[PDB]
Ligand binder design. Sequence first.
Ligand SMILES: [N]S(=O)(=O)[C][C][C][C]C1234B567B89%10B%11%12%13B85%14B%1158B%12%11%15B%139%12B%1061B%12%112C5%153B%14874
Ligand SMILES: [Zn+2]
Length: 257
Amino acid sequence: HWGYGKHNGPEHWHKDFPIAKGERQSPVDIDTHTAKYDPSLKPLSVSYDQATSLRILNNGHAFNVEFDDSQDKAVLKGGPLDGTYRLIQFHFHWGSLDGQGSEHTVDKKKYAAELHLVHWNTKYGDFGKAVQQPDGLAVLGIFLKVGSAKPGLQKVVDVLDSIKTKGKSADFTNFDPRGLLPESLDYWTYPGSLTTPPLLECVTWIVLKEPISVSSEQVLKFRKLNFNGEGEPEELMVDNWRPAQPLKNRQIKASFK
Ligand SMILES: [N]S(=O)(=O)[C][C][C][C]C1234B567B89%10B%11%12%13B85%14B%1158B%12%11%15B%139%12B%1061B%12%112C5%153B%14874
Ligand SMILES: [Zn+2]
């Protein structure tokens, strides 16, 4: 099955998922000089005050912090978006070393990690219908650099010991994702895809310019997770990122001057 190794990693994915070589694949390099300021873009509206987390899951690729998305609580709107997008989960991509791990790059710079807050367009009723539509998802991407600790991340870090291996989950209630946001909501945006199989071309990407800082100790704990299941040989969960894909016929827009 697909993964991140030499034998099943991103360069192989096109065999089972031919859209891997499509016209609107993610991630991409953000060339900051070429991205055009778009004064028609709106400030992003991130409303996470009533977000209700439920559970954290090691799915064998990453860990997912899952939300109750049965009501309209935690929503993303504005920015480049038409309508209302409901938060379903977040997860990260990270490296084996601090010099790699992000999926998007900025002028070819790789960050140590990247957080993805995934939201589905409520006009399609459920996520499974949304991912079949070109405007079905909005993913808010936030870069992580290593420096000062992020206090709002520590509750996630501390639960990781309990979901070390693939298929383990733990109750994970009352986590507030506001504590993972940087100060500024300045962003770049472009049309793209899921960055994991099935690689569906259903995402409006919104990538924040300002990274968050996390400590070396925090990212080291990400790197103790395992891709393997319990009672299998240990494969550290590191380098679970897809490299930048061709931009093709797309424009990256900036919300800021
Ligand atoms: N790296 S990425 O965010 O581009 C795709 C990884 C999350 C994929 C999804 B999980 B939830 B729903 B489940 B189904 B819908 B929503 B998030 B997306 C899909 B699965
Ligand atoms: Zn992701």
